[PDB]
Amino acid sequence: SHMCPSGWIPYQERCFYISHTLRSLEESQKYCTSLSSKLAAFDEPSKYYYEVSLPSGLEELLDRSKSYWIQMSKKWRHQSRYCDKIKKYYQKWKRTFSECAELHPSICESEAFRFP
Fold first, then answer.
1. Which of 27, 40, 54, 58 has the greatest CB tally within 10 Å of its CB?
2. How far is residue 48 from each of residues 19, 53, 93, 94, measured CA to CA in Å?
3. What is the torsional sign of CA 67, 72, 73, 76?
4. DSSP-based helix, strand, coil % in the chain, nearest 5
5. Which residues pair with 64 in a beta bridge?
6. What span, in angstroms and rounded, lies between the C-alpha atoms of 2 and 12?
7. Within its chain, how far is the Cα of 96 from the centroid?
8. Which positions carry the signal peptide feature in this UniProt record?
């Protein structure tokens, strides 16, 4: 099957890493890249631009008082000075837009590793 290292959240063939460190989008992207990872991708499913569906294991570990930088969803964009972060509204996390320079924690993802 697939596994993730200590402190990473498994889902499917992926592993998520929550970085609590406040950074701009660009610096969050660079940080994920330094982990041989990428900003976490949640493009689908989405019927409207603000919709995001997160795996439970990840969602339950997010701080509801914070917004997290994630991968920009290109399907909703016709480069841009706005970037995409998830933010909690009442009971639901939503995709929201912010100027890319804003300081937020972020979520990276890598592939999971197989074990024989």
1. 40
2. 27, 12, 13, 10
3. positive
4. 15, 40, 45
5. none
6. 8
7. 12
8. none
Q: Which of 59, 56, 54, 66 is nearest to 20 (CA)?
A: 66
The tokens describing 88, both together, are 């909690």
Give me the residues paired with residue 94 across strands: 51, 87
Domains and CATH numbers, the chain: 1-116 (3.10.100.10)
Residues contacting residue 94 through CB under 8 Å, at least 6 positions apart: 50, 51, 52, 86, 87, 88
Experimental method: X-ray
Structure tokens at 82: 């706005």
Question: Dihedral sign, CA of 12, 14, 15, 20?
Answer: negative
